[PDB]
Structures are given as C-alpha cells and as structure tokens.
Design a protein around this ligand. Sequence first.
Ligand SMILES: [Cl-]
Ligand SMILES: [Cl-]
Length: 237
Amino acid sequence: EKIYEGKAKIIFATLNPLEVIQHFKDEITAFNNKKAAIIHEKGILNNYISSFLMKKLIDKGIKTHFISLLNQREQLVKKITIIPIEVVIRNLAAGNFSKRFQIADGTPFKSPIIEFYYKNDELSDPMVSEGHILSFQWLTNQELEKIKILSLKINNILSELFFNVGIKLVDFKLEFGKLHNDEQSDLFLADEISPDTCRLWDISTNKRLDKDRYRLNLGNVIEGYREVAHKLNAIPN
Ligand SMILES: [Cl-]
Ligand SMILES: [Cl-]
C-alpha cells in the first residue's frame, strides 16, 4: 500500500500506523523533470548510504526518522509530517548558486551558506526567506533558529566523516518533519542523505561522485554512487 511516491522513493504503509517503509527506486530525474532515467542499483546504494549516514547522525544526537534497515531497497522509518521546506547548506559554490551569482563552481565560502526553498513542483521549489517561513507559519521563530543550528551541526558531522574518507561535502539538502499529533514535537531529519541530495567531490581529483554525474551527463553514474558507498563502508555483509 503506497502512501506517497516522489521522484526517487515510494513510502509504503505497514500494519503499524506510525511506521512506514521508505523504498528507494532506481529512477533519477533532473531539471524539473525535463530529464529522467533508470540507473540500475542507484536506489540500493542510496538506501545503504542514507541509513548509514542517518545512524552516524543519530550517534551524535541528531533526531531522525530512521528506525531500521530492512533490505536492499527499504528502511523502516517514523511516520511524520514533513515541513514543506528544503534546507540547502553550501560549503562551496555549485549548481544554480554558481550560475545565479556567476561565481565559479568550487569557490569556497568563508562560512557555510544556508538557503531555504518551499518544496513545490508546480512552482519549481521557489526560494523563501525566513520571514516568509514565519509568516506562513511553516515554523515558529524557535524552530527556525533550531533548524539552522541542526543544519550546521549536521554539516560539521557529515563534512568530517566524508573528509576522513577523502570526499568533500560541497553542499547538501535536508528535509525535516514533526511527530504526529505532538504540537511540541522537535524537528526530525527525514527524506534521505545520499548522492541524490549531497554534492560530493573526490578531494584529490575534484571528480564529482553524486547526481551531478547524471545532470551533467558525465557517465559512470552508478560508479560514483558505489565509490561513495565503498569509501563509507555503507554496504552490509
Ligand atoms: Cl543548486
Ligand atoms: Cl564544515
């Protein structure tokens, strides 16, 4: 029983109303769905990488939706209401940031840059200010300060763990949600943390390992995702 299907994942119900299955597909899309393809095994690797990184973040006290790894494509996660914001954290310039400020890809920032987007396909995920978020009551003042603190802490944790296996975390996107029926719920990290949601460059060569291999038609897409999995030791025995 499907509850939701997005561009790369399906959420399935379980017999427990408060737990759902996050199922990783092999679909990839880019440029507001102008470009789509099947990349065999991409979902398996994203499942393993995300479950791995969620657990690394849990180990440092980050609250997440992750419950358990079930199989090659699936993990058990908390059923939560997703806040309709994408938080993008940037360490170097890349993607549409580079393009709109005409700053070269790979330009390092003095401090990380957080940008917020309203998650909406129809509107192509428009950027929003803090005041917008607050006016529309998507978060309270306290939640918005918290989401930024958590995002930066997550950036530090992920940046370090990737650096230690020879990968630069260029930028990444987070989504958060809140527990059912709890108006005082803290912010739980949701969606995925994978090469679909993080720009990841090999430190020595600047080779891109992530979804940019698909976006920029660089070939060896699965090989990049597999390199990330291998270097992380994310694939179970
Ligand atoms: Cl971008
Ligand atoms: Cl950092």
